[PDB]
Symmetry: C3
Subunit: 259 residues, 3 copies
Amino acid sequence: SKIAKTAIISPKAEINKGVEIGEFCVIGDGVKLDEGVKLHNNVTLQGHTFVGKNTEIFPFAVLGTQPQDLKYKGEYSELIIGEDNLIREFCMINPGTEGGIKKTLIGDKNLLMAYVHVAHDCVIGSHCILANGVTLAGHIEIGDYVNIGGLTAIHQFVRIAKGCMIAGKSALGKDVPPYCTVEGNRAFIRGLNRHRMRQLLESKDIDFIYALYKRLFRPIPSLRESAKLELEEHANNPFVKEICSFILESSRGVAYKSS
Amino acid sequence: SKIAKTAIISPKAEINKGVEIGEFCVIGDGVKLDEGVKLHNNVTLQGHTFVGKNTEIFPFAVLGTQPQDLKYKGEYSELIIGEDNLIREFCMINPGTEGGIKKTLIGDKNLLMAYVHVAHDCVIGSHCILANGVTLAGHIEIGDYVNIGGLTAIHQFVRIAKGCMIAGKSALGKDVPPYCTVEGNRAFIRGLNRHRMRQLLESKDIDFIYALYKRLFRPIPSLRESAKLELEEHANNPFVKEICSFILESSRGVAYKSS
Amino acid sequence: SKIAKTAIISPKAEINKGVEIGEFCVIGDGVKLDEGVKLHNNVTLQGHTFVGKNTEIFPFAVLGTQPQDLKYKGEYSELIIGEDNLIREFCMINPGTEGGIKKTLIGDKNLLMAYVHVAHDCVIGSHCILANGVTLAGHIEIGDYVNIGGLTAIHQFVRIAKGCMIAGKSALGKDVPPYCTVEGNRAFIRGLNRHRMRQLLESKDIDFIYALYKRLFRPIPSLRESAKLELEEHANNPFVKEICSFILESSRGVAYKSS
Ligand SMILES: CCCCCCCCS[C@@H]1O[C@H](CO)[C@@H](O)[C@H](O)[C@H]1O
Ligand SMILES: CCCCCCCCS[C@@H]1O[C@H](CO)[C@@H](O)[C@H](O)[C@H]1O
Ligand SMILES: CCCCCCCCS[C@@H]1O[C@H](CO)[C@@H](O)[C@H](O)[C@H]1O
């Protein structure tokens, strides 16, 4: 519950109770820090940025500066961060753009290791882990319980569904359906995130999913056609709905499988 | 037109009119900031560094500290940056060395995204874009209108000519002739930067270039011999001169083509 | 021998004579700086960190903050750095954990270039060079005279013996025996670090080592069996002892060779 005297804090910023601010932090006039937020020394918060309860941010992280994108034109956008997040040293996160969704959103209980960059208009859920140097291009969507290995680059508009695991040093240019593990320069699906499914899903449903994907990724009928048929033959099945609707909504297309 | 009171500025530094300096900037005694320069909070400028008109530098960038090279011995070198540049967060740029060209030079209207490192003795032109984490080794030369994708590493003494495009995550160890696109770990030429040529060149000349490269990269006569012959059969043709003289001057050799 | 007035230094920290501290440095209550240490502006030193004589640390480096590892629980660990080290901009080094060796150790005369991250429980020797962006996972052991190229990632528990060279952009998941050169995504041994051996070893011994490895890496008898036999047929030979005992102690296994 201490605010360093050396910290520069705009009188227009809103700092709730219990907030800790380390030495030399720089806080702009559009920042909001909810209860229990802890900023180590030298954190830079600019733009219209909201930082949720109990989130902790380490030294030299930069949040809220304008997107790097050239299309940006001093637009009115926001950066919204959830609760119980851990944001490490040298992270750089920008707010959204008018051409995107006018915001960059991050949920709860996530860990963004050092040197992680989150570009404008990205959406990250909860319980995610982005390792050292992960680089997210613009307009990316990441579901809950997603792990992305260090030094991985995700291209613009890519969508990663819930429970996915992406190996380090990968370059992902396509969407990844729920509970899949990805790896490779031009990343592709190598199987299912068994370890994740085992903690969130029941055995019976895990088997169903394997079967589902095996049928979905058959070569003959296109993925799209198999997905639509899957929704018909199983109008009542949460997993089919979650997986198939994700697939049919894909813009960049779904990543390569193995069959 | 405001200079933060918390900023540390050597009385020997030269700060022109209209310069903006954010909170906690550290400016050494050999720095010069031309008109309209904007430094966000926490920018570090050391050594004999000149920053051109209207250039803007974001938080935690470090410019002017001594090169990492071991051969360096407290030499007298400079870092010269042009006008209208955008230098993002966490960039690190060093001045030259006595063994090199005694300076690191950057032209105008360039964008160096976050975590970009420019080593000693590098030369960057104008209208260039270096994405997140691009790493330039020493003595590199980059022409105008060059785009280098994120997380790409360029090895020492490599030269990239005008209008080239280098895909992200590449490792370039050879020179790249004008208007070529490169990609791959041990990077190679995959074709021409059509999108770039279309905005700078006329259709007729674009066709000529394709033809030129097709003949230059034939397997039998060496690239060098074809280049010399090309200069003979076309003593009067700017494109041939620009492309062939570049090739004949190569030290590390020209990158692999595809034919 | 000057300490910037703007620097924040805990009265509990121990600062020896001749120490230089730049503007805005942040020094916690468990830090110790031995004689001749030079901190540029904005260096952050936290936790129970010791910095040896004459070590120099550049702007925005962060040393001593808690490990990123989730298993960590406000444990009592240390970060110990040796003498004559050069630690560049944006480096991030964490102390050890209770599950590891309760410390992160770095020897003497090393150069850690910019953006280098050293995870909890790592052990680095002396005369080493880690290029831009090298990322070390936890519990890694690096011997003396090791060079690791830029943007290389070393996985947890990997051990690199004395005199090894690791090419840039590699991903190492296995141990590397003394005097070997490694390269590749899933890194493997490509030969010997001749350049290194030539400065530290006599010609006769260099020949012996080549022969040793040629016999060790034969396909039929396992590496382990050949190593044990090598120790028997040469109970008195420092090189055999150094190389073979390293191999037999491997946890993650030894890297792939080429024969
Ligand atoms: C397969 C083709 C993939 C093309 C991907 C293009 C991504 C460009 S986006 C770019 O990403 C940066 C991440 O560092 C952000 O900082 C910028 O603001 C944003 O504009
Ligand atoms: C194919 C072989 C390629 C060899 C390339 C060697 C590059 C070493 S240079 C080195 O690059 C660093 C970039 O981070 C700079 O900081 C250092 O000052 C500079 O000395
Ligand atoms: C072949 C399989 C290799 C698995 C390697 C797993 C490494 C996870 S460790 C992890 O490394 C980070 C480096 O950035 C540190 O910051 C964290 O504290 C530490 O917990």
